[PDB]
Amino acid sequence: VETILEVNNTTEATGLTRLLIPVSSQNKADELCAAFMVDPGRIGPWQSTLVGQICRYYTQWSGSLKVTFMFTGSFMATGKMLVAYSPPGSAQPANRETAMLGTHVIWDFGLQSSVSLVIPWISNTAGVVTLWYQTNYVVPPETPGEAYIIAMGAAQDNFTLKICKDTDEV
Amino acid sequence: TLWYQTNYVVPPETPGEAYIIAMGAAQDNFTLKICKDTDEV
Amino acid sequence: ANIVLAYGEWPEYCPPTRPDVSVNRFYTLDSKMWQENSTGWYWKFPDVLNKTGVFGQNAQFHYLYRSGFCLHVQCNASKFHQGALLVAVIPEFVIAGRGSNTKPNEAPHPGFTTTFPGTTGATFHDPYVLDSGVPLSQALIYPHQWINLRTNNCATVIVPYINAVPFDSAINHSNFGLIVIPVSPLKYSSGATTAIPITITIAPLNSEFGGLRQ
Amino acid sequence: ANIVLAYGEWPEYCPPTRPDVSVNRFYTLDSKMWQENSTGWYWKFPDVLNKTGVFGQNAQFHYLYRSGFCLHVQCNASKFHQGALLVAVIPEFVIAGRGSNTKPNEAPHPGFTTTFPGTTGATFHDPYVLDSGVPLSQALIYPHQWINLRTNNCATVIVPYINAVPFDSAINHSNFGLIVIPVSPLKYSSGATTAIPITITIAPLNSEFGGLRQ
Amino acid sequence: ANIVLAYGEWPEYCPPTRPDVSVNRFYTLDSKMWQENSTGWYWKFPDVLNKTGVFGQNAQFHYLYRSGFCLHVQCNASKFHQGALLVAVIPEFVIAGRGSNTKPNEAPHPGFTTTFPGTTGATFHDPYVLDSGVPLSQALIYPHQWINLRTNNCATVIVPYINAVPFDSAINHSNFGLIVIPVSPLKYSSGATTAIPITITIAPLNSEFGGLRQ
Amino acid sequence: VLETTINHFFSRSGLVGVVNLTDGTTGYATWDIDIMGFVQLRRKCEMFTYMRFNAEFTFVTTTKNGEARPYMLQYMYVPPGAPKPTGRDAFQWQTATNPSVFVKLTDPPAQVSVPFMSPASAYQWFYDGYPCPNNMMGTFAVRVVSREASQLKLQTRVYMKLKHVRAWVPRPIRSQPYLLKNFPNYDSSKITNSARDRSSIKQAN
């Protein structure tokens, strides 16, 4: 089941605004917007989701994942994004043309409103999903130049779990 | 000729100034004959 | 969507290696910020992706190259913006030099960052003459589309391999150029987004490489 | 429109009276005024319609109750507003008490106007924990929809009878709760409507009453 | 010629990319100069070709690796030289440390240039114990050949993928080692060549790569 | 519908180059074949990206005043790659692989045919890239066959005709004036508009 990731888990953030990726119009192009890890059984954004809480009762997991983005913004505002998966062993990309050579989806706001990126295979050094401003956040007058992205994440039919263990949230 | 007939009505928060691009071409009936060097050069 | 096929031909193989796995992916360039006083942009294609991933690695360390392309240009604006773009491919797009000198050893010539811009493109100086001494009013003879911000927001161009030789170097010869020009400028009321993005994705259809010189 | 069936089951009868005439009508509650600094709303359903017309009269003067529901949540805004709502049904939605006391006879407990709000609903105090100590980030495990103000403006949920006993009192036991939460807040430019309405309509599908104790 | 198949199994695919064009070529290492007082040589194979051409490029920028190998060891001497070599492959060949310390934080350990020699190999210090504390007198349990300078001058070993996991990293884990040892030393009369070459060629049969992490 | 074909659009004779001979005091006269010479056929061949054609070359040689005396003349076609002649009596004139034409002044003008001599599949003048020395097309030397040195100055006119011409990838027609011979350099200042001005937009001037 899809479940909202807490990708904005940094400090100086209130309760609910930790679930939102901010995107603005005063935000130059060919530049990074966000980045997070993929491993669910680890402290980070995957700790607020349900697959992360379930995969903590078990000590081994395997299979593919699925990360679904949803753009909460105005109808008249368009623009593109580059969603980029970088497999384990590689560090976070430093440029947009370096990320465009990895796994990438060019997801625009005009036609689509929710893109989905499948994570091919992860074992139990984890893989990094980055999200890049590509063209702009262009907006007509009398419309706010600030929107949000809700990130959700779930497992697939390949996901299998094994070797139980009591959790450590308590 | 190209005539303003009714208006250019516009809602608020939208520019009241637009443009028209005019293009032109021939048809299948268009035929040409008796050559001559041009005079643009 | 309406797809424009360049010169009515599909890109096909040579009647050389074929990657077919990691080279047929959507290379998405950075978004260009179109504003009121913008002029236009152009890209040289066999050297736009010479530094990006698998295609760049397999095109720098080879000697013979032949491929077509599938271009997708999205231009997402609001419903309150207005304007129009002309997106067109030009085979053998030679950048001219701007000057008033008739001496061959004193007339200006464009640099390497102007003829071959790279993955970041380059802006026009005089878009009325396409920076080539040739007017853009009759630039509709090329495979082209209009991006009118009141009708659609995307354009697509499938262009085959246009060359007199079946194989050519992918580094020392740009095959064709992509040109985006705001014929009608961008207008908006106060309070809207003052700059709108333009996104370009590239698919190297039917790629062929030869001469693995490492 | 896209209809979400709760747990993949249609509401059906017990394998008791059946009104079938005046109870299968669209009870429309008052519109809630969603603003920038709003938190959310929740409704308890077998006591939201206990004061409204035929269903309230036939549910107050009976003793056994069993029915499903058909919820329709419209959220009509302009094309210049932006935001997102999460609308979800929660079986056995127990309102928690907010305090820092561990003594059973001194710890706070919610009142009757907080646990059973009535036909006017109630607002959340801490929507990040659903006022139950449980995070809303994983509140997508329930039957739910998103109302995104750039895609659609309506949601529909057909929920069956979720209970461990085939009959229950419609006054002393709320079966399930409806929760609307603005995950993404409402934004608008100056001059637009500063508050947008949310309308809810309810259809008591397959109602059954028993024990006419007057 | 007599070909030794390691453990009676042919290298096959996984029941991932397959280059099949530029990776199935004979990588020839430099010739080793075998003399009278020589001891032996060993090579770690998934890191012997990690700096050489297409296989090195496709194995450094990937994450999963699985391949077999076809080894050819030529040892061309005259008809007046005499001696014998033992050429054998060892799965999971762990280089031991030479010392007389029993403290875990003070006992010696081999460096990176000793465990992973590279494309230039490494020489034994004590070939009687294979630099592993295990005698070479019973090193004939591995797939092996004898290069006797009075019978033949070449050896060939086709070795499959020997591992407990179907995929593994080609950089941080050497799969198996090749060992050449002059059991019988080299003898020659005065005036002959005082050092004879040993040439090794490698064919990566049935290679598979995965996880293009660039 | 026949005067609009590309073959008829290009196939027509016409001046392509004036060569001056002196026979003092260099004796000979060379001429590198290029169709981009005048600004009248350059504008018609810059309309297309690729072209493929054979050529017919006509040599009309007159004297200074105009009278034609019966002297022998040697024309020599130097294919792409062969060295040009350096003197009036060099060894490049006696080379058997340089096709020569021997004709008098009182004879009708000379006429030869040159095929497609490019290693590619078609000519191209717009080459976007770096090496366009690919289409050289040859050279045309001319001298006066004589043992001693003559005392006349000639004037040759090379008329070129195109035949069997094929065109590919049309491109728009250049509006800006020319500045160089091998480069499409325009002037950044003083950009000439492609349409003559009128008074108002609401008229029919």
Side-chain angles (χ1 to χ4, degrees), chain C residues 85-106:
Chain C
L85 248 104
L86 174 62
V87 42
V89 295
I90 294 185
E92 299 290 332
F93 181 57
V94 177
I95 292 294
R98 296 184 294 115
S100 192
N101 273 357
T102 47
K103 343 234 341 80
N105 2 32
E106 290 90 330

Side-chain angles (χ1 to χ4, degrees), chain D residues 131-176:
Chain D
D131 282 18
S132 183
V134 61
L136 91 161
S137 73
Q138 45 191 351
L140 304 189
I141 174 115
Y142 297 114
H144 72 284
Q145 287 204 5
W146 290 93
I147 299 171
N148 199 1
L149 288 183
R150 59 162 298 151
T151 311
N152 52 358
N153 273 6
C154 83
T156 299
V157 173
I158 296 169
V159 9
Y161 185 72
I162 309 292
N163 202 2
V165 291
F167 285 94
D168 214 356
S169 66
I171 303 168
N172 292 316
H173 177 75
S174 89
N175 249 342
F176 66 97

Side-chain angles (χ1 to χ4, degrees), chain A residues 78-79 101 104 106 134-135 139-140, chain C residues 26 28-29 31 53 76 78 193 199:
Chain A
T78 173
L101 299 172
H104 73 96
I106 320 271
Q134 148 128 240
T135 60
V139 73
Chain C
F26 293 160
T28 298
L29 305 176
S31 291
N76 42 0
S78 81
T193 317
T199 318

Side-chain angles (χ1 to χ4, degrees), chain C residues 80 191, chain D residues 80 189:
Chain C
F80 286 85
Chain D
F80 286 85
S189 278

Side-chain angles (χ1 to χ4, degrees), chain A residues 86-88 90 101, chain E residues 63 211-214:
Chain A
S86 159
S90 315
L101 299 172
Chain E
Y63 189 47
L212 181 35
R213 296 329 278 281
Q214 115 274 266

Side-chain angles (χ1 to χ4, degrees), chain B residues 6-33:
Chain B
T6 60
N7 212 2
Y8 181 75
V9 55
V10 73
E13 311 288 30
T14 295
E17 214 285 329
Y19 290 105
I20 296 173
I21 294 173
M23 296 173 284
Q27 293 284 106
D28 303 67
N29 294 257
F30 193 80
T31 69
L32 286 158
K33 105 163 347 193

Side-chain angles (χ1 to χ4, degrees), chain C residues 18-100:
Chain C
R18 296 174 178 90
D20 218 318
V21 49
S22 199
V23 76
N24 62 306
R25 65 181 301 281
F26 293 160
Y27 296 98
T28 298
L29 305 176
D30 42 18
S31 291
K32 291 296 179 183
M33 207 62 66
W34 173 30
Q35 299 171 358
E36 280 197 300
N37 53 2
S38 184
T39 76
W41 307 272
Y42 64 93
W43 290 269
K44 267 66 184 302
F45 261 100
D47 64 78
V48 73
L49 299 175
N50 272 330
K51 303 290 179 68
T52 80
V54 173
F55 185 82
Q57 272 165 270
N58 264 27
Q60 285 180 353
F61 295 106
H62 280 85
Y63 189 47
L64 300 177
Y65 161 72
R66 172 175 184 174
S67 78
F69 283 97
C70 180
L71 276 61
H72 310 277
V73 176
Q74 290 97 5
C75 182
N76 42 0
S78 81
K79 214 66 69 183
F80 286 85
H81 294 87
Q82 66 184 0
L85 248 104
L86 174 62
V87 42
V89 295
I90 294 185
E92 299 290 332
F93 181 57
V94 177
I95 292 294
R98 296 184 294 115
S100 192

Side-chain angles (χ1 to χ4, degrees), chain A residues 3-161:
Chain A
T3 312
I4 298 107
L5 268 68
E6 186 170 356
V7 181
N8 199 359
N9 55 357
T10 76
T11 324
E12 77 274 348
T14 46
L16 196 58
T17 75
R18 290 165 73 94
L19 298 175
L20 301 170
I21 301 300
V23 296
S24 35
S25 34
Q26 35 178 16
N27 233 169
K28 293 234 212 270
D30 204 81
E31 103 177 357
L32 177 57
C33 163
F36 57 93
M37 299 291 288
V38 175
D39 204 17
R42 194 175 176 177
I43 64 154
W46 288 86
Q47 196 169 1
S48 87
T49 175
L50 186 57
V51 55
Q53 295 291 321
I54 294 298
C55 83
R56 196 172 290 273
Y57 287 103
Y58 295 151
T59 299
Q60 295 181 3
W61 59 91
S62 300
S64 44
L65 291 183
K66 184 173 176 64
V67 176
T68 299
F69 293 135
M70 186 182 77
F71 183 72
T72 68
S74 162
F75 182 77
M76 292 291 174
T78 173
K80 291 184 185 293
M81 291 271 160
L82 180 64
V83 185
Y85 177 69
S86 159
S90 315
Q92 181 183 358
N95 312 325
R96 178 220 61 91
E97 60 271 341
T98 297
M100 140 228 163
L101 299 172
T103 306
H104 73 96
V105 195
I106 320 271
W107 157 48
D108 49 351
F109 300 154
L111 308 163
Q112 240 178 328
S113 157
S114 159
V115 71
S116 315
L117 198 279
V118 171
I119 303 301
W121 186 267
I122 63 153
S123 159
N124 185 7
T125 167
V128 176
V129 173
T130 44
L131 193 145
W132 300 81
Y133 300 142
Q134 148 128 240
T135 60
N136 212 2
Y137 181 75
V138 55
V139 73
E142 311 288 30
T143 295
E146 214 285 329
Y148 290 105
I149 296 173
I150 294 173
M152 296 173 284
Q156 293 284 106
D157 303 67
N158 294 257
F159 193 80
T160 69
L161 286 158

